[PDB]
Design a binder for this molecule. Structure first.
Ligand SMILES: C[Se@@+](CC[C@H](N)C(=O)O)C[C@H]1O[C@@H](n2cnc3c(N)ncnc32)[C@H](O)[C@@H]1O
Ligand code: SF4
Length: 340
């Protein structure tokens, strides 16, 4: 059940780096179909005659390449920067915001030039020291879910752990965290898990680990001394959401009881979608229950790209207030970092 690609592309230059060489050896030994591509942003010949087929096959394709854009993007409100270790995901979350993100690809990409990437992270750390600089590693990917294949996140964790002013964070929907339990994190990595109501997970989150898997993973991670956090997102106003989310937090407190939760964090993100979401999501997930009715929403305009639909102010406040009551009830002295 850990992700293993059924098709793999390599950039030729990728073989010049340890990880690229190691992955080429791994997959050729596994007898998996391997191909060459000039650029990891330009992958041709993924199988499928329909768009739906090409999309689903892309989600089973791994692309191994070199990160050439060594400017890191901002990753607010989570962190100062997105550290680029991977992009894309094997999951099929109906609502996934990566589906309509500019220039995102459906296939999973891993970058092999870690020396370059971490060196650049250090330069960013230096530029702001002694202020703390936080890096998000799961900004455009499920970095944790992919990591059993590469150990890139484990290396980033140990890199950041050796710094004085750097911090690392990431959020996952996957339970496959065993290889990370002995990482020398040094208290500088926040290990988060995406949680939601039974309704949302059951209807919209196929291809991911279950709620119990995520919580089992959370207990391991915490027991290994990682700082622990949860991302309650997408907060979705389905029929019976009030009770649904009440039961989430009740079940969450029960599955974590005994443990010290004095440094536990929460992040709250309401369901958002873009103007092209309807056409894209319907083509890929035609049986979905996902409500993309724009008329009931408030549009937030884009800045340099296009904007997004969020719930109307009064609906969003209602969601925020309710979630904050639940977190106060079941997790007193846990910090809500933001609602957006
Ligand atoms: C893009 Se997700 C990358 C990290 C990892 N693969 C993971 O899923 O946790 C980051 C978070 O954002 C949420 N999220 C995704 N799409 C939306 C959305 N459309 N509206 C509102 N939230 C959305 C997901 O539930 C995650 O909690
Ligand atoms: S696990 Fe995260 S990145 Fe993967 S499809 Fe689901 S929301 Fe998107």
């Amino acid at each position: 059940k850990p992700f293993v690609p059924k098709l793999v592309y390599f950039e030729p230059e990728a073989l010049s780096y340890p990880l690229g060489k190691e992955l080429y050896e791994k997959f050729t030994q596994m007898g998996i179909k391997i191909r060459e591509t000039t650029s990891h942003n330009q992958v041709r010949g993924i199988p499928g005659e329909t768009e739906l087929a090409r999309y689903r096959n892309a989600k089973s394709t791994l692309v191994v390449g070199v990160r050439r854009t060594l400017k890191f993007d901002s990753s607010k409100p989570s962190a100062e920067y997105a550290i680029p270790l991977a992009t894309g995901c094997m999951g099929h979350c109906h609502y996934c915001f990566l589906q309509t993100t500019l220039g995102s690809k459906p296939y999973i990409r891993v970058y092999v030039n870690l020396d370059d990437i971490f060196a650049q992270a250090q330069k960013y750390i230096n530029e702001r020291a002694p202020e703390i600089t936080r890096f998000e590693a799961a900004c455009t990917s499920d970095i944790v879910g992919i990591d059993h294949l590469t150990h890139s996140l484990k290396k980033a964790i140990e890199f950041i752990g050796a710094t004085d002013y750097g911090r690392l964070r990431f959020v996952t929907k996957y339970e496959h965290v065993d290889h990370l339990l002995d990482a020398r994190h040094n208290g500088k990595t926040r290990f988060r898990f995406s949680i939601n109501s039974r309704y949302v997970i059951n209807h919209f989150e196929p291809g991911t680990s279950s709620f119990d898997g995520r919580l089992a993973a959370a207990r391991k991670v915490a027991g290994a001394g990682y700082k622990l956090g949860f991302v309650v997102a997408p907060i979705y106003r389905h029929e019976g959401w009030e009770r649904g989310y009440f039961e989430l937090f009740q079940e969450l407190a029960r599955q974590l009881e005994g443990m010290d939760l004095s440094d536990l964090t929460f992040e709250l993100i309401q369901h958002r979608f873009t103007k092209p979401a309807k056409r894209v999501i319907e083509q890929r997930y035609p049986k979905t229950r996902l409500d993309l009715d724009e008329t009931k929403r408030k549009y937030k305009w884009g800045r340099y790209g296009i904007g997004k639909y969020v719930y109307r102010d009064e609906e969003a406040k209602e969601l925020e207030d309710t979630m904050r009551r639940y977190i106060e009830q079941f997790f007193p002295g846990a910090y809500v970092q933001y609602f957006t």
